[PDB]
C-alpha cells in the first residue's frame, strides 16, 4: 500500500493551469511501509478512471485528449526507504484542445487524478461573470511592469463541482505622472515620464483591453519637488491642474484619477503653504470637472492636517470615491479608539464611510516576525472581533510586482487578504491566486509573467 502524490503539490489532486503553454509536474510513491527489498513500480495513464471520478466528486470533467509525455516512469523504491524515485508529467498544449477543465488519472502500473485547465483567449475555463464581492485596488509601477499583467491574475474559488474563476482586480492605478511648474515657473503641468508616456499613447493596448475584462483604470498623480501640488494652488493654478487633468482622461480614455498625496516638498514657511483647506477646494473643483469619473485619494505622512475636520463646509470623504493610505503591510483603522495596534487618528478623513476605506495597503517586502503578526493581528481582531466590517470592502496593493529572491512569503499572499476575509471567512469560499504556483506563474521568480514589451 502507498500513495501516489505530486512532488511540488500538496493537493491530492492537482490542478495545473494551461494558458497556451505546456504545463508539467513530478509526482512520486510514497509506501506506507519501508521497502523491504529494492523494487521499481511503474505508473501509467488510466483515462477509464474518469468516469469513476465524475460521480464521486459530482464534477462534468473529459479526459484530457492532449499529448502527455511520461518520463522517468519507473519508480525505484531503495530498501529502507519509503519514497520512490520522481517521474516527469509533461502536458502538450496544442491548439486543438478547448477550453475546459480535463482529468488525467495516473495509476501504478493508490491513483492520482491530475486536473488541467486550458485557458481561452481571455480567461481560465470556468471563468464567470460574476463580479468580486469587494474592490480589489491594484498599482502597477509602469517602470518595471506591463499593466496588462492585471489580465492575466486571477482568484480560483471555490472546491470542484463549484469552482469559479473571477479577475483578482477591479481597479488598476498606472504609476505614475508628476506634478511640476510649467515652463515659465508659474502655473503647474502634468509631466509624464518616458514609461508612462507609451502607456498612455497606446492605451489601445494597454488600458482598452483592461476596461474590456471590468477593470476601471486609472492614473496616479504624484509630486515632483517643487513644492507645487494639490494642497497649494491658488484659484488661476487650480484651474489650469483641473482642465488638464480633466483633458488627460479624456484624451486617453481614462476611468478616473488617484491623488498620490506625496512627493511634493511643500515648504514650511512662506506664502504658497499646503492647507486642508485648499486640497477640499481643489477636489471640489476636479470633481465639478470630471463629474462621474473616479477621484482617489492615497494619504501619507506628507499630507496636510485638518482632514478629519470640515474645511469651509467641505469633507474630502464626501467627495472622493476611494481612500487608502501609504502605511503598507498593516490595517489602519482611524475609527478606532483604544486601538491596540497603534492610534490611526491622523488618517481619518471627514465624511468618508468606512467602506470607501483602503484599510489594508499591501506592499512586495519581506516581513519581520513582529511586523507578520502586526499585519495579520490587525486585519483579523479588526475586521472580525472588533466588528469593522466595513473596512473588509476595499482593499489596496501598492504596486503589483516582481516576485523575486527574499519576498516569496509576502509575494505568496500580500494580492489574496482581501478574498481571504471576504471569501474564505466571511464566506465558506476558498480562494487561490491563478497562475500562481509552477513554472511561468506569478510566484516563479525566474519568469515574468506579463513583462514590459517597450
Given at each position: 500500500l502507498g500513495?501516489?502524490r505530486s512532488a511540488?503539490?500538496?493537493?491530492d489532486?492537482?490542478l495545473?493551469?494551461m494558458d ?7 509526482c512520486?510513491?510514497t509506501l506506507?511501509?519501508?521497502?523491504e527489498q529494492?523494487?521499481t513500480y511503474?505508473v ?5 478512471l ?5 460521480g464521486?466528486?459530482g464534477?462534468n470533467?473529459?479526459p484530457?485528449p ?8 519507473q ?5 529502507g526507504?519509503q519514497?520512490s524515485?520522481?517521474?516527469?508529467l509533461?502536458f502538450?498544449?496544442d491548439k486543438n484542445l478547448a477550453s475546459?477543465?480535463?482529468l ?9 487524478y491530475?486536473?488541467?485547465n486550458v485557458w481561452?483567449?481571455?480567461?481560465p475555463?470556468e471563468?464567470?461573470?460574476e463580479?468580486?464581492?469587494?474592490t480589489?485596488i491594484?498599482?502597477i509601477?509602469t517602470?518595471?511592469?506591463?499593466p496588462?499583467?492585471?489580465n492575466?491574475?486571477?482568484?480560483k474559488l471555490?472546491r ?7 479577475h ?13 511648474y ?7 503641468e502634468?509631466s509624464?515620464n518616458?514609461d508612462?508616456?507609451y502607456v498612455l499613447?497606446?492605451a489601445?493596448?494597454y488600458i482598452?483591453?483592461l476596461?474590456?475584462?471590468g ?9 515632483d519637488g ?12 487650480s484651474?489650469?491642474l483641473v482642465?488638464?487633468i ?13 491623488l498620490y ?6 515648504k514650511?514657511?512662506?506664502?504658497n503653504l ?5 486640497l ?5 473643483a476636479l470633481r465639478?470637472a ?6 482617489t485619494?492615497?494619504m ?8 478629519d475636520?470640515s474645511?469651509?463646509?467641505i469633507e474630502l470623504?464626501k467627495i472622493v470615491?476611494?481612500?487608502?493610505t501609504?502605511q503598507?503591510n ?5 475609527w478606532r479608539?483604544?486601538?491596540?495596534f ?14 470607501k476605506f483602503?484599510?489594508?495597503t499591501s ?5 519581520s516576525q513582529e ?8 486585519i483579523?481582531?479588526n475586521?472580525?472581533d472588533?466588528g469593522?466590517?466595513?473596512?473588509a470592502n476595499v482593499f489596496?496593493?501598492?504596486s503589483?510586482?516582481k516576485?523575486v529572491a527574499g ?6 499572499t500580500y494580492?489574496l ?8 471567512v466571511?464566506?465558506?469560499?476558498n480562494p487561490?491566486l491563478v497562475?500562481?504556483?509552477?513554472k ?6 525566474h519568469?515574468?509573467?506579463c513583462?514590459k514589451?517597450?
Amino acid at each position: 500500500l502507498g500513495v501516489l502524490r505530486s512532488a511540488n503539490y500538496a493537493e491530492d489532486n492537482p490542478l495545473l493551469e494551461m494558458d497556451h503553454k505546456n504545463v508539467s509536474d513530478e509526482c512520486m510513491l510514497t509506501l506506507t511501509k519501508p521497502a523491504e527489498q529494492t523494487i521499481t513500480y511503474t505508473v501509467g495513464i488510466d483515462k477509464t478512471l474518469v468516469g469513476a471520478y465524475n460521480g464521486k466528486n459530482g464534477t462534468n470533467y473529459t479526459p484530457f485528449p492532449g499529448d502527455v509525455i511520461l518520463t522517468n516512469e519507473q519508480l525505484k523504491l531503495e530498501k529502507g526507504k519509503q519514497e520512490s524515485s520522481k517521474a516527469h508529467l509533461e502536458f502538450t498544449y496544442d491548439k486543438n484542445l478547448a477550453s475546459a477543465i480535463y482529468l488525467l488519472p495516473l495509476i501504478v502500473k493508490q491513483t492520482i487524478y491530475y486536473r488541467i485547465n486550458v485557458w481561452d483567449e481571455f480567461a481560465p475555463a470556468e471563468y464567470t461573470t460574476e463580479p468580486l464581492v469587494f474592490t480589489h485596488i491594484g498599482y502597477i509601477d509602469t517602470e518595471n511592469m506591463n499593466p496588462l499583467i492585471a489580465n492575466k491574475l486571477f482568484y480560483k474559488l471555490g472546491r470542484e463541482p463549484h469552482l469559479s474563476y473571477v479577475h483578482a482586480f477591479s481597479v488598476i492605478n498606472l504609476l505614475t505622472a508628476t506634478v511640476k511648474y510649467d515652463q515659465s515657473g508659474s502655473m503647474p503641468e502634468i509631466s509624464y515620464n518616458k514609461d508612462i508616456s507609451y502607456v498612455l499613447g497606446h492605451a489601445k493596448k494597454y488600458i482598452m483591453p483592461l476596461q474590456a475584462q471590468g477593470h476601471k483604470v486609472c492614473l496616479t498623480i504624484k509630486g515632483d519637488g517643487q513644492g507645487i501640488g494639490f494642497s497649494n494652488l491658488n484659484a488661476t493654478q487650480s484651474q489650469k491642474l483641473v482642465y488638464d487633468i480633466r483633458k488627460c482622461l479624456e484624451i486617453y480614455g481614462l476611468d478616473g484619477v488617484n491623488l498620490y498625496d506625496e512627493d511634493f516638498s511643500y515648504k514650511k514657511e512662506g506664502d504658497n503653504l499646503p492647507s486642508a483647506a485648499n486640497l477640499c477646494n481643489f477636489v471640489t473643483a476636479l470633481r465639478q470637472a470630471i463629474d462621474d469619473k473616479l477621484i482617489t485619494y492615497a494619504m501619507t505622512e506628507e499630507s496636510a492636517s485638518g482632514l478629519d475636520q470640515s474645511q469651509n463646509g467641505i469633507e474630502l470623504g464626501k467627495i472622493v470615491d476611494y481612500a487608502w493610505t501609504n502605511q503598507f503591510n498593516r490595517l489602519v483603522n482611524p475609527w478606532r479608539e483604544d486601538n491596540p495596534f497603534g492610534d490611526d487618528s491622523q488618517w481619518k478623513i471627514a465624511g468618508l464611510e468606512q467602506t470607501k476605506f483602503g484599510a489594508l495597503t499591501s506592499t512586495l517586502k519581506s516581513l519581520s516576525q513582529e511586523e507578520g503578526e502586526l499585519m495579520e493581528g490587525s486585519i483579523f481582531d479588526n475586521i472580525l472581533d472588533a466588528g469593522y466590517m466595513d473596512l473588509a470592502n476595499v482593499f489596496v496593493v501598492n504596486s503589483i510586482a516582481k516576485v523575486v529572491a527574499g519576498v516569496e512569503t509576502q509575494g505568496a499572499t500580500y494580492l489574496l487578504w482581501g478574498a481571504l476575509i471576504n471569501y474564505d471567512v466571511l464566506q465558506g469560499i476558498n480562494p487561490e491566486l491563478v497562475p500562481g504556483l509552477g513554472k511561468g506563474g506569478y510566484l516563479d521568480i525566474h519568469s515574468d509573467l506579463c513583462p514590459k514589451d517597450w
